[PDB]
Backbone:
């Protein structure tokens, strides 16, 4: 049986960071990301397109939370426009 | 580095807005919706979906104005005054809106949708029905919402 | 000259950020009130146990944050009603906090009674002149 | 390197300046903020601070190349229900600590303004995490009231065992009520006992 | 110096917007500066903008007048509809009491439903709280 | 000439924050309205003021302990008889009353309220006798 | 540090008290109770709950007077002489007290409760009933105990 | 069975400090706080609202006495007014 998600995605479903993480600066879109233990966690309401995420949840108002590996570039759909976001960390 | 402007300045917004309003293209701007308003004699010929050659400079300044915002969908719609039939009217304004959207798509907008439609004088903006395409009811308008 | 109409004061990002947190907790709160008022329909009001009266129809405008008994004694002192306490007040306070403007004293007592719901109650006996405050059983 | 110690000279000063500015901005909106974060009107029966339920919908986990797990809605009881004496205000979450740092040419000026902007948005991210923490906690208690209305969680079961006058001749306590929580709130898993909120 | 161009120029300086569109003319009056907060009581410290809008539609004495009132997304649907209904009604009574006939006026309060900007952003919600006055 | 309000939301974020505050305040009020159990005062079960002239004396008592002793001594303060029906339990039902001026009809209402469902007070002013009943 | 003054000075307290008693606002101060009575002709028009625009400056300077003290509850009450009936008199005077507490609650006072009520000629302070709102029976008073 | 209170709260329900304390200086309100052993004890008649106390007593005249943890800020309700209070130690 596999695990269900991370339940750290419930915390990064809100803006509150995972405990003992490191903040990253997402530049280019309205997203935040943290780096907990060799995995970054993005809170956004854009759609993550390129770098492959391992886990997601999504709120009632449609902001998603993603658990993925440390990619320096995210690619997103904003509203059909495909954009990139730089992270630093 | 991240960029300050997206290839657009606020002085160029108000300069192109007051130059189009000086040229008679009425640019209203309500909130975050934007409406530019071209009279049909200023860009097409009379009762025809063929654009004149001099009006492509007007559409060049229209597309250089529409380069400056970020938008998801621009709806171009058009209606001319009542000429032969309402079916003739709707076919004429549908062809007019799709050829001005074809030129605005081949020029640089940054939009994702252009919604082109035409109506058979179903929305006049005066009760004066003075003529053909010389009437200000006979027009094309370009309406969008500026995104963020 | 071109101008969009509402040119307010300059804000800052503290109250911008508190506003966008505030609207999300506001509409999640009102849909919580929607599920609560549709699984139990509200049976009755509290106007039959707090009825309005002449000299209770004087108005007040109050922001307040402390315990209940000081505020109810001050409104009953202004409303010329003998205020009395039934039940001993618990060891934690029953904190109520009211910011309203120009509301009559019967409705101020009614949302005081709703604000101290399930811990206290207010009763007004207006054929006498008494505002009684009932503490809970626990 | 002298630009870098100019930058860290500007960083802590812009951090404490922005922290003081949003402290007065927080004190300006004080009646609105306890109107928003009304924890006092969200405590339960016996001054039970209600627990913080978290909600995650459309949950994917890619466990390997061959197996994934979807779930439709998840709820997690973080930060369980307990006895509280006083309700929490906003200011345990939102308030930032202002100490005035008493710790002091051309690239010093321009890197110290770059460091001053770095300290300003660093304090803005600390305020972003503080409104995040209070939105998580207050939406959890609102979500507790929603799931208790939907019959998805158990309410807490207090037990006030009364004792009479108690103790020996050196000490009496007259009405001696000891109040325990026997049943903590939890999500019930018999799923047919839930309630459906259809409103109009 | 007392004409329509002068009175819409200091109406622009008193930050009530005014667009001409063919036969329709609409004023947009922000409730944030021209109403007391979350209330239908009129902000009478901004009385010269209201004197300028009654000086504006003194010029148009035969048109029927739509007055519609608007909000942003905060609150209940009944709260938004009742608050914009009350604000459009008290602007309708201000124009009726300052001398427009009662069957030229028609108040209607839409609870945020036309939404000339978005409501996800702060300046867009500030632009959404407004009063539309259409006439012919 | 007048002024604006002082901490008015005259600012585009503060109007959204403060109208969010009034929306969370009235939705707090209607969730308080729906989960607030009230009783009607025709079925409120508490003791009325029995309006006897011996019971309209402004007394003063600070005391905490078991109910039958205080109700006996206010009955002999008001020259009323004191009956007790039912059995006093092993744990005693306990009151706290501290007032330096109260009518003893209202002290009787307070002792009936703090008894509640463990005990109850009847009062017969025609035969001039109060009565503690247990259950 | 802890603050010496609370945004208030005692010299400004007595300067506002002499200025209000020079302007005919009766400012009594008996121990810790304080009573500021405006005559009703200095605020409203005759038999009407409507403020003059000149009286808002008077309401600004009594609001600056009430800013200087730290209090709990301001009670504003109003009464006037008999005009039509006592029911119209009570509605008139509680409307007058509610608009003066609406402006004082909008302004900077620091009172937690402001009670507002009106009496229908039920406490005259003279037997001379020769005026309308020009009589000094017609007044609105501001009573508060200054806390500590 | 839990303990009753502290019976030190009967001493700090008067003004008398506990044996072997060090007093704290309360500014901004009428309160007296002592610190006995990693707990502070504050004699008030204002009501403490923000930090959360561990035990309370109240005398005949409405004086409260609280036992709580070492917190540098008390926040009180005076008379419907929320104020703050400094302690030092």
Residues:
């Amino acid at each position: 049986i596999p695990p269900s998600a991370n339940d750290l995605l419930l915390h990064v479903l809100e803006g509150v960071p995972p405990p003992g993480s490191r903040r990253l600066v997402v530049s280019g879109g309205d997203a935040r990301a943290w780096l907990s233990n060799e995995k970054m966690y993005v809170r956004t309401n854009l759609t993550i397109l390129s770098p492959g995420w391992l886990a997601s949840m999504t709120s009632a108002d449609g902001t998603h939370a993603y658990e993925m590996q440390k990619s320096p570039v995210l690619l997103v759909s904003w509203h059909g426009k495909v954009m990139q976001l730089k992270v630093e960390g | 580095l991240p960029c300050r402007v997206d290839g657009a300045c606020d002085a160029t917004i108000i300069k192109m807005m007051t130059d189009l309003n000086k040229k008679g293209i009425k640019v209203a701007s309500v909130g975050q919706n934007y409406l530019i308003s071209i009279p049909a004699s200023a860009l097409f010929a009379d009762q025809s979906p063929r654009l004149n050659w001099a009006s492509y400079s007007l559409l060049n300044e229209i597309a250089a104005f529409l380069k400056q915002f970020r938008k998801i969908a621009i709806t171009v719609t058009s209606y001319s005054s009542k000429y032969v039939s309402v079916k003739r009217e709707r076919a004429l304004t549908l062809a007019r809106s799709r050829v001005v959207s074809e030129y605005l798509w081949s020029q640089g907008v940054d939009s994702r949708i252009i919604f082109t439609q035409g109506l058979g004088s179903d929305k006049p903006i005066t009760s004066y029905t003075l003529g053909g395409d010389r009437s200000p009811n006979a027009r094309v308008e370009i309406t969008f919402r500026r995104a963020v | 000259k071109f101008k969009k109409p509402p040119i307010n004061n300059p804000s800052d990002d503290a109250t911008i950020k508190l506003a966008e947190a505030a609207v999300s907790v506001s509409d999640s709160m009102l849909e919580m009130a929607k599920v609560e008022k549709v699984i139990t329909p509200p049976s009755k009001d509290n106007t039959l146990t707090i009825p309005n009266a002449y000299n209770l129809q004087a108005r007040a405008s109050v922001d307040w944050s402390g315990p209940i008994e000081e505020l109810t004694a001050r409104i009953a002192k202004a409303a010329h009603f003998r205020f009395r306490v039934l039940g001993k007040s618990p060891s934690v306070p029953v904190l109520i906090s009211i910011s309203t403007k120009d509301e009559s004293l019967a409705e101020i007592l009614r949302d005081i009674d709703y604000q101290a719901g399930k811990k206290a109650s207010i009763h007004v006996y207006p054929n006498s002149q008494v505002v009684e405050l009932r503490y809970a059983k626990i | 390197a002298l630009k870098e110690t100019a930058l860290s000279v500007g960083a802590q000063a812009g951090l404490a300046w922005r922290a003081k500015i949003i402290d007065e901005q927080l004190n300006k909106q004080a009646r609105n903020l306890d109107a928003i974060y009304d924890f006092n009107s969200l405590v339960l029966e016996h001054n039970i601070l209600p627990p913080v339920l978290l909600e995650g919908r459309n949950t994917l986990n890619l466990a390997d190349a061959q197996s994934i797990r979807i779930s439709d809605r998840t709820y997690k009881v973080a930060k369980q229900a307990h006895f509280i004496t006083t309700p929490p205000t906003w200011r345990q979450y939102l308030w930032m600590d202002y100490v005035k740092p008493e710790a002091p040419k051309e690239i010093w000026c321009i890197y110290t303004e770059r460091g001053w902007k770095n300290g300003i948005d660093q304090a803005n991210t600390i305020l972003e995490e503080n409104i995040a923490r209070i939105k998580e906690d207050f939406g959890g208690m609102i979500l507790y009231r929603k799931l208790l209305a939907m019959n998805m969680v158990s309410p807490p079961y207090v037990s006030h065992t009364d004792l009479g006058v108690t103790g020996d001749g050196s000490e009496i306590h007259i009405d001696d009520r000891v109040l325990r929580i026997t049943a903590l709130p939890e999500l019930n898993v018999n799923s047919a006992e839930w309630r459906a909120a259809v409103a109009k | 110096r007392d004409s329509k161009r002068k009175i819409i120029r200091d109406l622009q300086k008193q930050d009530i917007q005014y667009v001409e569109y063919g036969d329709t003319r609409t004023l947009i009056i922000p409730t944030d500066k021209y109403f007391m907060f979350s209330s239908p009581r009129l902000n009478e410290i901004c009385y010269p903008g209201l004197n300028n809008v009654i000086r504006l539609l003194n010029f148009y004495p035969q048109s029927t007048i739509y007055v519609a009132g608007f909000t942003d997304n905060v609150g209940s649907r009944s709260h938004k509809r009742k608050l914009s209904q009350a604000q459009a009604e008290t602007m309708m009574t201000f124009l009726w009491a300052n001398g427009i006939a009662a069957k030229r006026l028609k108040a209607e309060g839409y609870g945020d439903k036309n939404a000339i900007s978005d409501n996800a952003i702060i300046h867009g919600s500030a632009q959404n709280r407004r009063i539309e006055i259409q006439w012919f």
